[PDB]
Amino acid sequence: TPALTVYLDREIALDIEKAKVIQSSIEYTTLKNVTSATEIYYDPDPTSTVIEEDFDTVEAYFSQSPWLLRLELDRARMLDKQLTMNQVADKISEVFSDDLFVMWSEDNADKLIIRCRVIEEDQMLKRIEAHMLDLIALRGIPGISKVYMVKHKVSVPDESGEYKNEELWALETDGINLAEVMAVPGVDSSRTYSNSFVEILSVLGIEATRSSLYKEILNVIAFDGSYVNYRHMALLVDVMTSRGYLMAITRHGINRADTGALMRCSF
Amino acid sequence: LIDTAVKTAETGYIQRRLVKALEDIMVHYDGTTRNSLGDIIQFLYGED
Amino acid sequence: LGDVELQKELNSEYEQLVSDRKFLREIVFVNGDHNWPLPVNLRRIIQNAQQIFHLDRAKASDLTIPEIIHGVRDLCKKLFVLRGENELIKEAQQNATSLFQCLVRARLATRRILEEFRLNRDAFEWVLGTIEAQFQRSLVHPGEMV
Amino acid sequence: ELAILKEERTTTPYLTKYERARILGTRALQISMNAPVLVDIEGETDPLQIAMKELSQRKIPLVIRRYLPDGSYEDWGCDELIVD
Amino acid sequence: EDNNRIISRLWRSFRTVKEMAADRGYFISQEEMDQSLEEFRSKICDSMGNPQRKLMSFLANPTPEALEKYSDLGTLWVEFCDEPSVGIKTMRNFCLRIQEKNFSTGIFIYQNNITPSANKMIPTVSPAIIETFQESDLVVNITHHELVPKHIRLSDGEKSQLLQRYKLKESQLPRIQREDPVARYLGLKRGQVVKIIRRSETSGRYASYRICL
C-alpha cells in the first residue's frame, strides 16, 4: 500500500476551493481514463462522411488515408475531471502533430466525438490505437492514481499562546512518487511524507530515512494500544542505517557484514 | 483457531531474525553503543 | 522590595525559562505534548521531603532567594553522564541532559519552591542531594546487552 | 603502555551491577577454597554471606580491570569504587 | 502559460543553487540571494520569453570565516548547460573552460540526461572536481525539509580531535554514501565527516557524526 501524505501551504489549506484545484493537477488522467469507445471507419472521401450522425458536425466545421479513427469521450467523466475538448486535443498535438489530423465535436452535441485520420495499414491502426490508449497523458503526475481530500486536526499555539486545535485540509494519494509531487506549486515542499522509506532514501538521504523508518515502525506498534519505550525502536533503526544504505534483516543484509565466519554461519 | 496457529510461526521467524541481527550489540565504558567489530551504532545509548 | 541587585538574578532566571519554553515548543515538541518519559521523578521526591520535615503549617521560611537560584544552577553542572575535561565531552555532557535540566528548572522555580512546596533550609539541601544521587543511579550500566 | 594513569581515569566511579555480581561470586569462591577472610565472621557462615559482609565494609582485596573498546584499560580497586 | 512554468522551475532551481553555494562557505551577495522572480524574468528571457542559460552562470569566492575554517576552499564555477542531452562535444569545451580559467570546482546542471559514455569524462579532469545535477532534482531544496537535520562538515582539525576522544579508526564511524542527496549537496569527498545535530524526544538535542565514503 504505497501512499503519500501531501501537506499544503497554509493559505491554501484553509480554503477548500483552492485545494480542489491542487487535487486535479496532481491526479493522473490518461486518455484511456476518459474514453468510452473507439471506432474504425472506411471514410474514402476526405471532405465528407458516410456517418449521418457526424454530418452536420463535420460539414459546418470544414467551412490522406481512407481509414478513419473515431473515438468517443464520456461526457460525465470529462465534466467531473474539468477537461475541455481543446486541451485534450492540445496534448495529442505535441506527441502526434502533423501525422494525425484532429477534429472534435462541440460540448453541446449529443455525443462528444473526436475524429482522427492518418495523413498494408489495417493492423497499423489497431497497433496505433493500442499505442494511443497506453501512452497519451492528458495531465497530472505519473503514478498518482487517486487523490483523497483529508482533514487534519493539528495543534498550533494561539496568539494568546494557548494550545488550540485547528482544522486544515491535506491530500493523501495512492501509488508512489515523491520527487515530482514535491515540486508542484501549492504543495508545501518542506513537509511532504511517504510511507515508502526506500523512495525517501533516494530523495531525501539517510538521516531523513532514520526518522521515516521510526515513524512507520512506531505506528505499527502503537496501533493496538501497546507502547514500547523509544530507545528500543531507536536502536533497531540505527542498525538498519549505519552502513549508509538500508540493510534488510534477511541473509542478504545480515551476512554481508565483516563479522566472523562462525557467527555468520549460525544464521 | 487457524490464524493463531498460522501466524504464531510468522512472528516466531520475525523474532529469530531480530535477535541474530542485534545479539552482539553492547554498551561500552565510554558510553558508546557498539557491535563486535567496534563499529559505532550510537554515540550515546538511547541518546540519554 | 526594591532591591535591584536581587532583581538581576530573578530576571536572569525568568530569561532562562523563556529560552527553554521557546526552544522546546518550536524545535523539540512541536505538537505541544508535555507529558514524556523522563528520569529522576521530582514530584514524588518533593512530597517525600514534605513528609520527613513536616512541611505543613503557615510559618515563614528562612530560605533565602540567592540560595535557591545559585543552588539550582550549580546542580545542573553535577549531573555527570560522562566524565573528563575534554571540550567535546563537556558539549556532549551538556547535550545529554538538556531536556532533563529544563524539567528541573521548571519545577525548582523561585515562586514554586516558596509558595507551593514551602521548603526550608534543611529540606531544600536534602532535595538537591537526592536528585543528584538518584540521577547517577539511573544511568545505564556498561556491559548491558541492549 | 595500554595502562591509563590514575589521575587520568575516566570511567564511572560507581560499581555496576555486573561488576558487583562478579566480585561477590569470585570472592565467595575463594573463601570456600579457604582463602584468608578479612572480616570477623559471627553467626553468618555461608560463603556468599561472608563475601557480602566484606563488600559492605569496603574490604574486598580485588581490582577491576575495565577494558575500553580500543583494548586499553583502567584498573580500579574495589576499595575505591563507590557502592550504592 | 506553459512558458511560465519553465521559467518558474528554473528560477526556483537558481535559488537552490545559491543556497547550496552559501552553505558550502562561499560568499554570495545579500542582493543576489533575495532576487525576486520578476527581476529574474526581465534579465534572463528573450523578447519571446525563452531563457538563455549562459547568462545565468556565475562565480563565487569563500567568505573569510569559511577560509579560516577550511583552507582547501578555492573558487567555485556554476554553469547551466544549454544542451538538453549532454554529449561528448559539450563536455570537452566545459572541461577546457574550467582548466583555462583555473576554477577549483565546477557545478554542471543539465536538463534531461547525461549519457553513460559522457559520464566517464568526469573523473578524468582532476585535481579539479566536477559535480553534476539534474535540473529536476534542484526545484526543491531538500535541506529545508522537516526530516532533514542540519549537516555541518567538520574541519580537519576538529576531525582529528574527534577520533582521539573516542579512540577510533576512521573505518568505525557510521557511513554516508557519496551519491546520497545531502552528501552531493555539500560536495563531500571521501574521508570527510559531517556533524549532524538532530532533535531527540528523550534528550532534546543530540549530535550524530557520519563519515563520507
From TrEMBL, chain A:
Domain of life: Eukaryota
Record localization: Nucleus
Family: Belongs to the RNA polymerase beta' chain family.
Function: DNA-dependent RNA polymerase catalyzes the transcription of DNA into RNA using the four ribonucleoside triphosphates as substrates.
Official protein name in the record: DNA-directed RNA polymerase subunit
Organism, scientific name: Komagataella phaffii (strain GS115 / ATCC 20864) (Yeast)
Portion of the parent chain present: 1115 to 1405 of 1743
Automatic annotation (TrEMBL), chain D:
One GO molecular-function entry: DNA-directed RNA polymerase activity
Compartments it resides in: Nucleus
GO biological processes: transcription by RNA polymerase II; transcription elongation by RNA polymerase I; tRNA transcription by RNA polymerase III
Signal peptide stretch: none
CC annotations in GO: RNA polymerase I complex; RNA polymerase II, core complex; RNA polymerase III complex
Keywords carried by this UniProt record: DNA-directed RNA polymerase, Nucleus, Phosphoprotein, Transcription
Superkingdom of the source species: Eukaryota
Family: Belongs to the archaeal Rpo6/eukaryotic RPB6 RNA polymerase subunit family.
Protein name: DNA-directed RNA polymerases I, II, and III subunit RPABC2
TrEMBL record, chain E:
GO cellular component annotations of the record: RNA polymerase I complex; RNA polymerase II, core complex; RNA polymerase III complex
Chief localisation class: nucleus
UniProt entry keywords in alphabetical sequence: Nucleus, Transcription
Gene3D superfamilies: RNA polymerase, Rpb5, N-terminal domain, RPB5-like RNA polymerase subunit
Domain RNA polymerase subunit H/Rpb5 C-terminal positions: 140-212
UniProt GO MF annotations: DNA binding; DNA-directed RNA polymerase activity; RNA-directed RNA polymerase activity
Highest taxon, organism lineage: Eukaryota
GO biological process, alphabetically ordered: termination of RNA polymerase I transcription; termination of RNA polymerase III transcription; transcription elongation by RNA polymerase I; transcription elongation by RNA polymerase II; transcription initiation at RNA polymerase I promoter; transcription initiation at RNA polymerase II promoter; transcription initiation at RNA polymerase III promoter; tRNA transcription by RNA polymerase III
InterPro entries: Arch_Rpo5/euc_Rpb5, RNA_pol_Rpb5_N, RNA_pol_Rpb5_N_sf, RNA_pol_subH/Rpb5_C, RNA_pol_subH/Rpb5_CS, RPB5-like_sf
Cellular location(s): Nucleus
Pfam family, one: RNA_pol_Rpb5_C
Domain RNA polymerase Rpb5 N-terminal: 6-97
Entry's family note: Belongs to the archaeal Rpo5/eukaryotic RPB5 RNA polymerase subunit family.
Database matches in HAMAP family: RNApol_Rpo5_RPB5
Entry protein name: DNA-directed RNA polymerases I, II, and III subunit RPABC1
Organism: Komagataella phaffii (strain GS115 / ATCC 20864)
